[PDB]
Amino acid sequence: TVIKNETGTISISQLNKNVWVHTELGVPSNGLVLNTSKGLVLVDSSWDDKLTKELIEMVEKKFQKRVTDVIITHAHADHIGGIKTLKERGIKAHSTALTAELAKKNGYEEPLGDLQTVTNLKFGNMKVETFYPGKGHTEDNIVVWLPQYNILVGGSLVKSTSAKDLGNVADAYVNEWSTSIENVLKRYRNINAVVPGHGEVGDKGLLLHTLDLLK
Numbered sequence: 556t557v558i559k560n561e562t563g564t565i566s567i568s569q570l571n572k573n574v575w576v577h578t579e580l581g582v583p584s585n586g587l588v589l590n591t592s593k594g595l596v597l598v599d600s601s602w603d604d605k606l607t608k609e610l611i612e613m614v615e616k617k618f619q620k621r622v623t624d625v626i627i628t629h630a631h632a633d634h635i636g637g638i639k640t641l642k643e644r645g646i647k648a649h650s651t652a653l654t655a656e657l658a659k660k661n662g663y664e665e666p667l668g669d670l671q672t673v674t675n676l677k678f679g680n681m682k683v684e685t686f687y688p689g690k691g692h693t694e695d696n697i698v699v700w701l702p703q704y705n706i707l708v709g710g711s712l713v714k715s716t717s718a719k720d721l722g723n724v725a726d727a728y729v730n731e732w733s734t735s736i737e738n739v740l741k742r743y744r745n746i747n748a749v750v751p752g753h754g755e756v757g758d759k760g761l762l763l764h765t766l767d768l769l770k
């Protein structure tokens with residue numbers, strides 16, 4: 556089930572009953588929409604305020620619920636870009652402290668900086684674990700794990716199956732990135748789906764593919 560806006564710039568696709576992938580064109584970028592009994596939780600918002608607001612309005616219309624929380628997976632403009640929108644709408648913008656520090660450094664309003672290396676959140680019955688595996692795509696990048704579904708949100712740490720390019724490495728720790736991905740692999744022994752920063756949802760093979768690119 557894939558639903559879109561009128562421009563086609565924003566789409567949401569159901570992964571399972573309560574888990575949807577949101578995709579926006581800024582180049583596409585993925586995150587998750589989690590439909591919980593206590594509102595909507597996003598893993599990542601969008602590139603900027605306009606798209607972030609459109610995204611929120613879309614999902615809030617679709618599920619007739621408040622977006623309560625967003626997990627920000629790193630501090631780059633294309634991840635922190637809708638922070639003003641989140642804060643004005645009373646959306647809790649979770650991030651690690653490092654991501655918050657970097658967001659400020661980039662001139663952005665600060666997300667919460669509440670996430671620790673391992674943070675388990677629960678929204679109604681929806682369980683969410685955030686994990687900082689070490690530096691890779693950026694110094695601060697985290698992954699998100701849905702232990703009820705064994706779904707891993709790789710974000711920019713994980714490239715898609717067709718991707719031959721690691722993307723922006725100006726802020727990357729290319730050598731460390733392999734170790735960080737290994738940390739994710741060691742941590743989650745049974746992964747089902749993995750959501751890359753952009754491109755189609757895959758499986759653990761995406762982590763391997765990314766290691767291959769990094770070699």
Ligand SMILES: [Zn+2]
Pocket residue numbers: 629631692693711723
């Ligand atoms: Zn980035």
